[PDB]
Amino acid sequence: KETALSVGAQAGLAWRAKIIDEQLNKQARNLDAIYDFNSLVLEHNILPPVLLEGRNTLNLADAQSIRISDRTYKVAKQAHFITTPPTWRQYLWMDYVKPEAPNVTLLPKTKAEKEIWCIYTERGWKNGIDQANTILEENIARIKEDFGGMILYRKLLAMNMVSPPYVSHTDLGVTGDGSEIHIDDRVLRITALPELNVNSAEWRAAVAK
Amino acid sequence: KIIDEQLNKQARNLDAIYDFNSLVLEHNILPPVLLEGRNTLNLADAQSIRISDRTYKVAKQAHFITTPPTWRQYLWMDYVKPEAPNVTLLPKTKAEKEIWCIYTERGWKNGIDQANTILEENIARIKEDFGGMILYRKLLAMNMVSPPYVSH
Amino acid sequence: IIKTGDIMFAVLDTSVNSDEPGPILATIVTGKLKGSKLIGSFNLPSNADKMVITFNTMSIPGAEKTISISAYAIDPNTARTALASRTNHHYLMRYGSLFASSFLQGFGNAFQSANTTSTLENAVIGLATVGKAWSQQAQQLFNTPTTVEVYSGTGLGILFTQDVT
Amino acid sequence: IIKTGDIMFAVLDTSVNSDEPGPILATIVTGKLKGSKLIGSFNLPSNADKMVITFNTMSIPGAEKTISISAYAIDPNTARTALASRTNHHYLMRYGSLFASSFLQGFGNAFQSANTTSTLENAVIGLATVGKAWSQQAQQLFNTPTTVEVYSGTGLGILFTQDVT
Amino acid sequence: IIKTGDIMFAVLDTSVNSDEPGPILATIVTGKLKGSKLIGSFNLPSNADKMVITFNTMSIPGAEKTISISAYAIDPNTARTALASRTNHHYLMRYGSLFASSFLQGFGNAFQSANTTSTLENAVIGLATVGKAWSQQAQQLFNTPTTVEVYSGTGLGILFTQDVT
Amino acid sequence: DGCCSKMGGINYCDSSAGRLVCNNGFYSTCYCTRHAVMDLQFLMGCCLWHGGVYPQLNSSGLVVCNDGYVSEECSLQK
Amino acid sequence: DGCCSKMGGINYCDSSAGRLVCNNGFYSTCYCTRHAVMDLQFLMGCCLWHGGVYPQLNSSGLVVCNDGYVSEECSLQK
């Protein structure tokens, strides 16, 4: 009964998971065509940071207390280094297994028992399907806000309202003892994080055609 | 057994490859082992990165030696012949005999693969040792190490 | 936290006869607790129209502990405490043995007594003397009850007795 | 707070015979208490004309609580304390067995004695000897009581005895 | 750490009859603990319908330790508590001996009585007095139970009782 | 299974390529070892592209990957 | 439940509108998802436009909303 409902939930979830993973394997090249993070990855192999924009910001504290501004901008993630750029693979792919354990001992024998077993299987199948749809929606929202934060950072860096990161090279020559040596040791140091500027002169306007 | 008979089959060209006595110095001292690495990139966290071109490591110090080593202490696998199949679980049905057959086959293939893996690791080890020897010879030729100084 | 007297499900895999008491284990297959197992024993009834199971030794996975919540068993979707087995085990055997030993005794004595009014005499001989010992031995072993025996593939429902944490 | 001796109503779903006592549960269905359940047992009377149920262990949902209000029951639509089941279970089997063992004894002895004034003698044999052991065994098992049994689909009303909070 | 009452596979290699107590050893053949052996003994049930093994003295090799987790056995691939052996060892011997001694007594007394209404007299002689002594010795030896005997090449399933370190 | 069909049969396996060479001088499309070019694109298992399944034994249905991601797909739904 | 009756039959459920689409290129009047525009003018429940039903199993038989307002209509009568 209820066990049939739960195993129908498991089977429907795994089936829809297989369907969506098979479809994502079938069409992938458009997705990796669109999602090229290395285009936005800067010259020092640095992941660009993440920004958020909000409009018409009004909250209420209590009576006789409301605060309203036009726009706000949120630094989500401070920019860090990277070795290889990310992909769609770690966001949009979802886990897949198959529950191959039917723990059925009260097998359906009466006719109404078979009927309720069938309808519990139905509702479990559709519930697992809808849960898979919810998980997919979660993942696509996550990758949407990631790419949107990257696009916002590039736009504001073009706007000249966020400081670009500051870097420096410190080099030492042949270093080590008579047992261990390195040819040309080199350290790369960042000083200034990507951060906003507030002064009025640094705002720069642009007008399209 | 098969791989030991193969190693015994290819006898002379093995030592023709891995001669050692052509490399030993004039005071009968085994030359040391060198390690070469290229295009070194390292990270630890955000803003922790280290980049260099090449790195050299002295692996094992030179020492005196009586006889040169050969490939027998690097490539000859051991051979124990066990003749003790002890039967605790015994098949009675043809299904039991069939699963016995297929379990026997897959264990046989698995053991063959494991033996090949062991041989490959030993081959890599002796290749590493000989390459360290050749690296020491070339670096001493290219004036990268002080020669060993010996007083009698 | 388990409320007092609620009903859960389990599956019994180990079969045992009502001859020697012993440990019996079942596995909880659904509900709040999953992967839990339960060992206990039975009780021997005065009348074998039913059989109930004393289940007290509960083992829970995840962490190492063994609580001792007592629980009993019921027939699932039947809402009864009986045993689904055979219970006509030892009626007809002892009845037929006693009646046959009787008939032997009677054949010998009455067909001896009818001599007033040789193979017939040898029938008298055999039944006359082998009836008596079999009769007293049958009245001796007539006291053995009829057994019940659970099976290795029966599910069960479990009612609770006290609360746990 | 429950008044001393008010009447509530519950539903009994688990059935059992009056053979081995144990925990029996009902569920409060109406009134202030919703989702509350009750575990208890029964007793055995001297004669099987009625059966009362000893209910003592009440569990109320919401909190982890198990109160111990002891209460009894009356049958719905009868307003009486009896049990709605069968009471003629174990009379006629033992009566017929005893009377048959008697008739066997009497047939063997009297049709043995009536010779003065083969197969008939064999009839005398069988009746004469299988009467007596069966007769004493019927004297042994004549005392088997008639049990009662609650049913799995009977609702009930519960009168109270003491107060709680 | 072993779960409270789980099941392991083992192989029993030593056989014994249910006649004289002695040490018995089995060997766990798979699972986490490898090469482990278990010595213990047996107990005699009231009836020969099954047989169980008292297995407590656990010796795990490698180290010089001897733990004493008590464990019992079930029939593998049957999940029942019986023994795969014979339960009819000495039924027919005592049955036939008692019946023949009786028949001898009956032959002597009845064919001595039949002298009213040499060689056949010697038949009366022999059975007449060898029946009685053999009858009382048969009633003496009639108490011998039928033993069962485990085999030396049978595996077993071992359920645990308590937890170990 | 049947690899060198309509050929002379299987000769041997080149493990450097990991491919069977039939009696005709060609590489069979069947492979012999698993250390060869496998064109696999779809895989199985949960806690995938994360830290993998945590070895902690939890009595509930909660399973979390080693990088901290909770796997509701592999988790029990209740 | 026949929606594209005397039509081409369904094609699929366009989930952007939550609407079944017949094989002839028309939107069926039937829906498929909860995420679609109905016209709700009647709902059940208790403590509507209030704090909702308070989840605590109270001793008193009345039901009181989470704002402290009492739902005497959903409460039983005496």
Coordinates of N, CA, C and O in Angstrom, one line a residue, chain C residues 34-127:
Chain C
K34 N 14.2 2.5 9.7 CA 14.5 1.6 8.6 C 15.9 1.0 8.9 O 16.7 1.6 9.4
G35 N 16.0 -0.3 8.5 CA 17.2 -1.0 8.8 C 17.3 -1.5 10.2 O 18.4 -2.1 10.5
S36 N 16.3 -1.4 10.9 CA 16.3 -1.9 12.3 C 15.9 -3.4 12.4 O 15.1 -3.9 11.5
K37 N 16.3 -4.1 13.4 CA 16.0 -5.5 13.5 C 15.6 -5.8 14.9 O 15.8 -5.0 15.8
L38 N 15.0 -7.0 15.1 CA 14.3 -7.3 16.4 C 14.4 -8.7 16.7 O 13.9 -9.6 15.9
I39 N 15.0 -9.1 17.9 CA 15.1 -10.4 18.3 C 14.3 -10.6 19.6 O 14.1 -9.7 20.4
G40 N 13.7 -11.8 19.7 CA 12.9 -12.2 20.9 C 12.6 -13.6 20.9 O 13.4 -14.4 20.4
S41 N 11.5 -14.0 21.4 CA 11.1 -15.4 21.5 C 9.6 -15.5 21.5 O 8.9 -14.5 21.2
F42 N 9.0 -16.7 21.9 CA 7.6 -16.9 21.9 C 7.2 -17.2 23.3 O 8.0 -17.2 24.3
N43 N 5.9 -17.6 23.5 CA 5.4 -18.2 24.7 C 4.7 -19.5 24.3 O 4.1 -19.6 23.2
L44 N 4.7 -20.5 25.2 CA 4.0 -21.7 24.9 C 2.6 -21.6 25.5 O 2.4 -21.5 26.7
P45 N 1.5 -21.7 24.7 CA 0.2 -21.5 25.2 C -0.4 -22.8 25.8 O 0.1 -23.9 25.6
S46 N -1.4 -22.6 26.6 CA -2.2 -23.7 27.1 C -3.0 -24.4 26.0 O -3.0 -25.6 26.0
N47 N -3.5 -23.6 25.1 CA -4.2 -24.2 23.9 C -3.6 -23.6 22.7 O -3.3 -22.4 22.6
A48 N -3.4 -24.4 21.7 CA -2.6 -24.1 20.5 C -3.4 -23.5 19.3 O -3.1 -23.7 18.2
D49 N -4.5 -22.9 19.7 CA -5.3 -22.2 18.6 C -4.7 -20.9 18.1 O -5.2 -20.3 17.2
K50 N -3.7 -20.4 18.8 CA -3.0 -19.2 18.4 C -1.5 -19.3 18.9 O -1.2 -20.2 19.6
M51 N -0.7 -18.3 18.5 CA 0.6 -18.2 19.0 C 1.1 -16.7 18.9 O 0.9 -16.1 17.8
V52 N 1.6 -16.2 19.9 CA 2.1 -14.8 19.9 C 3.6 -14.8 20.2 O 4.2 -15.8 20.7
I53 N 4.2 -13.7 19.9 CA 5.7 -13.6 19.9 C 6.1 -12.5 20.8 O 5.6 -11.3 20.7
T54 N 7.0 -12.8 21.8 CA 7.5 -11.8 22.7 C 8.8 -11.2 22.1 O 9.8 -11.9 22.0
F55 N 8.7 -10.0 21.6 CA 9.7 -9.3 21.0 C 10.2 -8.1 21.8 O 9.4 -7.2 22.0
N56 N 11.4 -8.2 22.3 CA 11.8 -7.1 23.2 C 13.2 -6.6 22.9 O 13.5 -5.4 23.3
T57 N 14.1 -7.3 22.2 CA 15.4 -6.9 21.9 C 15.5 -6.2 20.6 O 15.6 -6.8 19.5
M58 N 15.5 -4.8 20.6 CA 15.4 -4.0 19.4 C 16.9 -3.5 19.2 O 17.6 -3.1 20.1
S59 N 17.3 -3.6 17.9 CA 18.6 -3.1 17.4 C 18.4 -2.1 16.3 O 17.7 -2.4 15.3
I60 N 19.0 -0.9 16.5 CA 18.8 0.2 15.6 C 20.1 0.5 14.9 O 21.2 0.5 15.6
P61 N 20.2 0.7 13.6 CA 21.4 1.0 13.0 C 21.8 2.5 13.2 O 21.1 3.2 13.8
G62 N 22.9 2.9 12.6 CA 23.4 4.3 12.7 C 24.3 4.5 13.9 O 25.4 4.9 13.7
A63 N 23.9 4.1 15.1 CA 24.7 4.2 16.3 C 24.6 2.9 17.0 O 23.7 2.1 16.9
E64 N 25.6 2.7 17.9 CA 25.8 1.5 18.7 C 25.0 1.6 20.0 O 25.5 2.1 21.0
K65 N 23.9 1.0 20.0 CA 23.1 0.8 21.2 C 22.1 -0.4 21.1 O 21.9 -0.8 19.9
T66 N 21.5 -0.8 22.2 CA 20.5 -1.9 22.1 C 19.5 -1.6 23.2 O 19.7 -1.8 24.4
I67 N 18.4 -1.0 22.8 CA 17.3 -0.7 23.8 C 16.4 -1.9 23.9 O 16.5 -2.9 23.1
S68 N 15.5 -1.9 24.9 CA 14.8 -3.1 25.2 C 13.3 -2.9 25.3 O 12.6 -3.3 26.2
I69 N 12.8 -2.2 24.3 CA 11.3 -1.9 24.2 C 10.7 -3.3 23.8 O 11.1 -3.9 22.9
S70 N 9.6 -3.6 24.6 CA 8.9 -4.9 24.4 C 7.8 -4.6 23.4 O 7.2 -3.6 23.4
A71 N 7.6 -5.6 22.5 CA 6.5 -5.5 21.5 C 6.0 -6.9 21.2 O 6.7 -7.9 21.4
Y72 N 4.7 -7.0 20.8 CA 4.1 -8.3 20.4 C 3.8 -8.2 18.9 O 4.0 -7.2 18.2
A73 N 3.2 -9.3 18.4 CA 2.9 -9.5 17.0 C 1.4 -9.7 16.8 O 0.7 -10.3 17.6
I74 N 1.0 -9.3 15.6 CA -0.4 -9.5 15.1 C -0.4 -9.9 13.7 O 0.6 -9.6 12.9
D75 N -1.5 -10.6 13.2 CA -1.6 -11.0 11.8 C -1.9 -9.8 10.9 O -3.0 -9.2 11.2
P76 N -1.1 -9.5 10.0 CA -1.4 -8.3 9.2 C -2.6 -8.4 8.3 O -2.8 -9.5 7.6
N77 N -3.4 -7.4 8.2 CA -4.7 -7.2 7.6 C -5.7 -8.3 8.0 O -6.6 -8.6 7.2
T78 N -5.5 -8.9 9.2 CA -6.4 -9.9 9.8 C -6.8 -9.4 11.2 O -7.8 -9.8 11.7
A79 N -5.9 -8.6 11.8 CA -6.1 -8.0 13.1 C -6.3 -9.0 14.2 O -7.1 -8.8 15.1
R80 N -5.5 -10.0 14.1 CA -5.6 -11.1 15.1 C -4.2 -11.6 15.5 O -3.2 -11.2 14.8
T81 N -4.1 -12.3 16.5 CA -2.8 -12.8 17.1 C -2.5 -14.2 16.9 O -1.7 -14.8 17.5
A82 N -3.2 -14.9 15.9 CA -3.1 -16.3 15.7 C -1.8 -16.7 15.0 O -1.0 -15.8 14.6
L83 N -1.7 -18.0 14.8 CA -0.6 -18.5 14.0 C -1.2 -19.2 12.7 O -2.1 -20.0 12.8
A84 N -0.6 -18.9 11.6 CA -1.0 -19.5 10.3 C -0.1 -20.8 10.0 O 0.9 -20.7 9.4
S85 N -0.6 -21.9 10.6 CA 0.1 -23.2 10.4 C -0.9 -24.3 10.6 O -2.1 -24.1 10.6
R86 N -0.4 -25.5 10.8 CA -1.2 -26.7 11.0 C -1.3 -27.0 12.5 O -0.2 -27.0 13.2
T87 N -2.5 -27.3 13.0 CA -2.7 -27.6 14.4 C -3.3 -28.9 14.7 O -3.6 -29.2 15.9
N88 N -3.5 -29.8 13.7 CA -4.1 -31.1 13.9 C -3.0 -32.2 14.0 O -3.2 -33.3 13.5
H89 N -1.9 -31.8 14.6 CA -0.7 -32.6 14.5 C -0.7 -33.9 15.2 O -0.4 -35.0 14.6
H90 N -1.2 -34.0 16.4 CA -1.1 -35.2 17.2 C -2.4 -35.6 17.9 O -2.4 -35.8 19.1
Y91 N -3.4 -35.7 17.1 CA -4.7 -36.2 17.6 C -4.9 -37.7 17.1 O -5.0 -38.6 17.9
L92 N -4.9 -37.8 15.8 CA -5.3 -39.1 15.1 C -4.3 -40.2 15.4 O -4.7 -41.4 15.5
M93 N -3.0 -39.9 15.5 CA -2.0 -40.8 15.8 C -2.2 -41.5 17.2 O -2.2 -42.8 17.3
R94 N -2.4 -40.7 18.2 CA -2.5 -41.3 19.5 C -3.9 -41.9 19.7 O -4.0 -43.0 20.4
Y95 N -4.9 -41.4 19.0 CA -6.3 -42.0 19.0 C -6.2 -43.4 18.4 O -6.7 -44.4 19.0
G96 N -5.6 -43.5 17.2 CA -5.6 -44.8 16.6 C -4.7 -45.8 17.3 O -5.0 -47.0 17.3
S97 N -3.6 -45.4 17.9 CA -2.7 -46.3 18.6 C -3.4 -46.8 19.9 O -3.4 -48.0 20.1
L98 N -4.1 -46.0 20.6 CA -4.8 -46.4 21.8 C -6.0 -47.3 21.4 O -6.2 -48.4 22.1
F99 N -6.7 -47.0 20.4 CA -7.9 -47.8 20.0 C -7.4 -49.2 19.4 O -8.1 -50.2 19.7
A100 N -6.3 -49.2 18.7 CA -5.8 -50.5 18.2 C -5.3 -51.4 19.3 O -5.5 -52.6 19.3
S101 N -4.5 -50.8 20.3 CA -4.1 -51.6 21.5 C -5.3 -52.1 22.3 O -5.3 -53.3 22.7
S102 N -6.3 -51.3 22.4 CA -7.6 -51.8 23.0 C -8.2 -52.9 22.3 O -8.3 -54.0 22.9
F103 N -8.3 -52.8 20.9 CA -9.0 -53.8 20.1 C -8.2 -55.1 20.2 O -8.8 -56.2 20.1
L104 N -6.9 -55.0 20.3 CA -6.0 -56.2 20.5 C -6.4 -56.9 21.8 O -6.6 -58.1 21.9
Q105 N -6.4 -56.1 22.9 CA -6.7 -56.7 24.2 C -8.1 -57.4 24.2 O -8.3 -58.5 24.7
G106 N -9.1 -56.7 23.6 CA -10.4 -57.2 23.6 C -10.6 -58.5 22.7 O -11.3 -59.4 23.1
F107 N -9.8 -58.5 21.6 CA -9.9 -59.7 20.7 C -9.4 -60.9 21.4 O -10.0 -62.0 21.4
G108 N -8.2 -60.8 22.1 CA -7.7 -61.9 22.8 C -8.6 -62.4 24.0 O -8.9 -63.6 24.0
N109 N -9.1 -61.4 24.8 CA -9.8 -61.9 26.0 C -11.2 -62.5 25.6 O -11.6 -63.5 26.1
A110 N -11.9 -61.8 24.7 CA -13.3 -62.3 24.4 C -13.2 -63.5 23.5 O -14.0 -64.4 23.6
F111 N -12.3 -63.5 22.5 CA -12.3 -64.8 21.7 C -11.6 -65.9 22.4 O -11.6 -67.0 22.0
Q112 N -10.9 -65.6 23.6 CA -10.6 -66.7 24.5 C -11.8 -67.2 25.3 O -12.0 -68.4 25.5
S113 N -12.6 -66.2 25.7 CA -13.7 -66.6 26.6 C -14.8 -67.3 25.8 O -15.6 -68.0 26.4
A114 N -14.8 -67.1 24.5 CA -15.8 -67.8 23.6 C -15.4 -69.2 23.3 O -16.1 -69.8 22.4
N115 N -14.4 -69.8 24.0 CA -14.1 -71.2 23.7 C -15.1 -72.1 24.3 O -15.1 -73.3 23.9
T116 N -15.9 -71.7 25.3 CA -16.8 -72.6 25.9 C -18.0 -72.9 25.0 O -18.5 -74.0 24.9
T117 N -18.5 -71.8 24.3 CA -19.7 -72.0 23.5 C -19.4 -71.7 22.0 O -20.3 -71.9 21.2
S118 N -6.5 -73.9 15.0 CA -5.6 -73.4 16.0 C -5.2 -72.0 15.7 O -4.7 -71.3 16.6
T119 N -5.4 -71.6 14.5 CA -5.0 -70.2 14.0 C -5.9 -69.2 14.7 O -5.3 -68.1 15.0
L120 N -7.1 -69.5 15.0 CA -8.0 -68.6 15.8 C -7.4 -68.4 17.2 O -7.4 -67.3 17.8
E121 N -6.9 -69.5 17.8 CA -6.3 -69.5 19.1 C -5.0 -68.7 19.1 O -4.7 -68.0 20.0
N122 N -4.3 -68.8 18.0 CA -3.0 -68.0 17.9 C -3.3 -66.5 17.7 O -2.5 -65.7 18.2
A123 N -4.4 -66.2 17.0 CA -4.9 -64.8 17.0 C -5.2 -64.3 18.4 O -4.9 -63.1 18.7
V124 N -5.9 -65.1 19.1 CA -6.2 -64.8 20.5 C -4.9 -64.6 21.3 O -4.8 -63.6 22.0
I125 N -3.9 -65.4 21.1 CA -2.6 -65.3 21.7 C -2.0 -64.0 21.5 O -1.6 -63.2 22.4
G126 N -1.9 -63.6 20.2 CA -1.1 -62.5 19.8 C -1.7 -61.2 20.2 O -1.1 -60.3 20.9
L127 N -3.0 -61.1 20.0 CA -3.7 -59.8 20.4 C -3.9 -59.7 21.9 O -3.7 -58.6 22.4

